[PDB]
Amino acid sequence: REATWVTEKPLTLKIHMHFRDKWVWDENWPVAREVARLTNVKLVGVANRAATNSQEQFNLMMASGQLPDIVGGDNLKDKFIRYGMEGAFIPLNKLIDQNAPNLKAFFKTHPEVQRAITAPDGNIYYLPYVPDGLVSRGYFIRQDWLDKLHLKTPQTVDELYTVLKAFKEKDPNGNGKADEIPFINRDPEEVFRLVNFWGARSTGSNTWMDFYVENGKIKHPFAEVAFKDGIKHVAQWYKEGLIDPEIFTRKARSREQTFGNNIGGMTHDWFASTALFNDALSKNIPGFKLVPMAPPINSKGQRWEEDARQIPRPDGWAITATNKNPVETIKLFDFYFGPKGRELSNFGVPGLTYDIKNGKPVYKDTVLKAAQPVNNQMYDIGAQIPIGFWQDYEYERQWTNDVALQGIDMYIKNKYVLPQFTGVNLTVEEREIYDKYWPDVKTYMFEMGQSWVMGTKDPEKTWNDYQQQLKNRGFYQVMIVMQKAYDRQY
Template sequence: MINKIIPSTAIALALAATSGTSVAAGDDDKYKVTDKPLELSIHMHFRNKYAWDENWPVAKEYEKYTGVRLKGVASKIGTNSQELFNLMLVSGNLPDIVGGNSLKDSFIQYGMEGAFLPLNDLIDNYAPNIKAYFEENPEIKKAITAPDGNIYHLAYFPDGQAARAYYVRQDWLDKLGLEQPETVDELYEVLKAFRDRDPNGNGKQDEVPAFFRHWEEMIRMVTLWDARTTGTDSYHQFYIEDHSKVKHGYVDETYRTGIRNLAKWYKEGLIDKEVFTRGSKAREYLLGNNLGGMTHDWFASTAGYNDSLKETIPGFDWIPMAPPASPSGVRMEENGRTTVKPDGWALTYSNKDPIASIKYMDFIFTEKGRNIANFGVEGVHWNMVDGKPTYTQEVLTDSQPVNSQMWSVGAQIPIGFR
């Protein structure tokens, strides 16, 4: 429970007190939100190991364009983001801004209790880019609106549909004279060939035909037999059938059929025997040692192995493939990007300049700010090529996955951005 509730009149007074904040003139300064430099505090701790760092290259870019510096106050050595959030709340000593992952419910609950400022009027009056985005995407606006009708936080809004895909060793297929599998039966034959025909050429039967960092991705393969496991990008969720029926894949007969077939494949050595124990290093170990043949995983980090392994494994060719068709002819990619993540940031009742704060947040919804939030610093991490932001070769060939590199410089973190 928050130990201080701010009345609506106090919010109004806070807004009135800062109404003199203005935008600097001139094209070079069109993103400035204050006449003079302003420092605001932010508690942002996420994924149990990252904390906002004002020295991030991306944070410095935001400051350069807006004139606002966000000073991180969350512990940089803490290892439990939710615990740090709770301690910050009960202290009653709130910073100007709070952000992090999986905080949507807290933002709404404590926002209605007065800990966070309602953003509706701030967005309407001072955030034209956010306002336009909500006008174009009313369902997204609805998704972050609290039961009392107020918006208390801005979320991370992913684009696109598919987030993960099947990846296969195309070089192994070529060596064995095989085509990418178009059906589940063809996939079965491909995996047997990977197991039996020594595609890595070391004279040993040590290949792991199909492997997964997350065992749920193995279970997801029941879709190859017309089953379902989830309705979101999270595991073990219900799904909506025909836009009206709430169902769960685990209770369907097709799910049992899929599990029986996966058990058969596992017994035959087509699926990694250590799928339940190998964990997050599965790709790194099995691909790095030229042992893994196929997986289902995130696009960005999975594709990166083409660059990181090209010198150590000659001819390494690791590419996505369309989902093989089920016996009924259905090709299903069950995983998809959610349109609204439960991540983002909010303004607290202690915020010293709500107008400057919402303008800062609005900058990240401009094309300039959006590119920084997604790709990092232009000329360092990316360049504009044929009108599209494109990562540099240094980023693409680094030993770390692109997303990990972005997190380390302050990009693609769970703030409010597109």
Template sequence: MTKKIVYMLAALGMLQVSALGNEKVDYKITKKPTEFSILAIQNGKVYNEEWSVFKEAFKDTNIKLKSASSKNLTDEMQAFNLAISSGKLPDIISLMYPDKLESLGMEGGMIPLNELIDKHAPNIKAFFEKYPRYKMDAVAADGNIYFIPDYYDWYAMKSAQGVFIRQDWLDKLGLKQPQTMEEFYQVMKAFKEKDPNGNGIADEIPYFDRTAEFGDKELLGLFGAQFGFYVDGNKVLYGPEQPRFKEAMKEVVKWYKEGLIDPEIFTRGFQGRDYMLRNDLGGMTFDWFASTAAYNTDKELLAKNKDFKFVAIAPPEYKGGRYAPDARTTYLGGWGVTASAKDPVAIVKYFDYWFSQKGYELSNWGVEGDTFKRDENGKKYFTDKVMKAKGKNPLQVLREEGVQFRIGALQDYEYEKAWGNPQANEWAEMYMKNGYVVDPMPTLKYTPEENKKLQKINSQLEMALKEQSQKWILGAEDFDSTYDSFIKRLNDIGVNEAIEINQKAYDRFINSSK
């Protein structure tokens, strides 16, 4: 999809089928209050029927959801497996892993929604017609729809992370922000050799990261290299077999050998960013815009270093391109109707409610007058209850009201902008508008037979790749002399069969919107 089409779609905004302006709409689904059971746990939080978002939805629709799991059971996969083993499924299941719902559907445990959507869900049907890419995400390998995804506002914002650099160190050393990969390398060397923190000790770490994925998604990705399966011109390829991977890995190996990368990059852990910045040691990283930008207003940090400034920059140019290798997917989980459901039609109508204008606003902003209001131009903004809560950030407050809990719905990027760090929003939009973000491979759907074969191959490929990459980067093995034997190992594991399976799944995915 071209950038022009993406922005045209983003400009069209959310489809508003059921309500326009302030027109009064009757959303009642059943004449009498009706209750359905739901298994839904997100980030350790069990669905709570007292959340204001779902109480408001009950007022509108007469449909009430009641949790089918104990509040003490906070692991969603454990709860899901218990429900399966008990043989007593709730009416609705929400899950982060839709492949589990689809597998259950192919076994008869989830109801195909295709015909129900066509007959009883005009909002979802129109949404799929307008955004065929979103419909493709919902279609299983057998052609059925077993769940409605929890969609990100992908056309408006797919950028998630970016390159951050210590602007105060650049200023101290009289350097400009690096524009090319060679300049990026030279800045790292300057950070290593010219004592930008001014303590007289060569303790600076030019590049650091919080996760062991720094070599695959991040540093290798900045060269435009891919660590796993990806699509190029509708053809599925495996990144480590490609020339760009070899180029990138050689550079990363060199940088580590020269001390430009944190020597504890694989072991430092998730608190690495905090340690590096609070101790004035780290120079660059690739990380989330919102949480990383927050260090610029951290009072404790600024009290120790008043000149501290950590800014996002454009990815360095390499061979004519700039690559941000981490992007939001189009969706994360979703919900579906089980074969135990007593009234599938009413449930699908309830699913459809969340794609109405009222449901769309409710799932993203909460209850009007409580968590959000509108200015004189109709623009929504969050109330002081959300923005000025003591001891809580805005997202925590919203989560406690049921906002953005995992259901089948569409996220509104404007909701995120309204509570997020303005500087982080600006940087994310800069990445989006300039086309730096590398689109992820779509979430492909497999038949049970394909899935069984692929899981076995993938587990071995991932283990071999991570093991070998660490050996190369840490200098335990020479890259040039062992690369060919590594490719032979991948072939022995079955990488070509995995490519064939993924190609079939991708071809199905492309045709699934028809």
């Protein structure tokens, strides 16, 4: 028996949580078992472990019969809202005010967050993953390769093109082989962000292919003429091999592969984990020096850093209408917003991954000296996972080295980060159009995007057909409701 118990008799619930296309909830996780012990509530996963698409799995579950008790994961906000209104997920407003003091307090002081997760009917259908921090990604380039080739840090897109071209043809790793890949990225979507170099947006926030606002008008990056011209340039860089040919397939371990084998020359990724490669590779590649660099001046004469930490993220978990124990569930959820629950969800297990010293959670040296970035380590034990939790930046500071810190401070000080889209609140009627067309349009945009990048389709020759399809697929119907909602507020 524990004072943190949310129920006297032991309670086990089923959870479907497939996330980031490669992970599933594991009751075996140290963190999970630690929370079970402290709350007397144990969660058992039911997600298909051999799945490669989390979203597909959510749909599969939505059509596999009786739903589990809890559903969680990344990029589920729209599904939580859509099916929440359909009655698949229950409203949490009441449950919170009456049984979740930690959350009621959090929302009271975080009105923007509460608004961001509220549905058109005014109901809260899930608890979000709430990131902590300001900046997210930044550009990194091989300083040792620049020095080896006697090149200066590229300040413009034209200078960058010359640098990447040199990386490709001048054998910087000096093994006499043309094995260098100028630009690499673990996120395929970052290839689309390259259009920034030519004054075109790729997304309005940390949420991929999100809308943005410009002079009181809602716009979507993939529908703009600037994207047509910008993507032509990206396609060219891809054809010339300046961009990793496996950009859409490599994914997750692109850094360990390309930097580890000394063939990657530049990327655009999160500061902390990316800078760590300098420490992880120092022994094998002596001169290895991956450093942050300001965004190059684009075709519009500006240095853009389009990405920023998003608070909250469209990630989290909800309670299904089939959950026979809703009050205990919300209490379990509330535990995560208390001091001990938040600590576990961020650092892992005390005595395992960290220890309390001077009263503060302090990571063990075995974790800090590991070859694997600290967040990857947390994922392995059930921490820093996209459930409904409040991230604590202190967990990140401990493994943010001086190189990363310098880059972070440079971006903050120089204000390269573009204003982020804070979204809009649609009425039920407006949301109906949104849920009917947006999902499929988004899918189509990505597909067209890859085709343009890989040269299987010429953006110039297919633009009119593309615009016609966006129309036929209801994209402009979605755009109109978005604009009506935007004005309804500003």
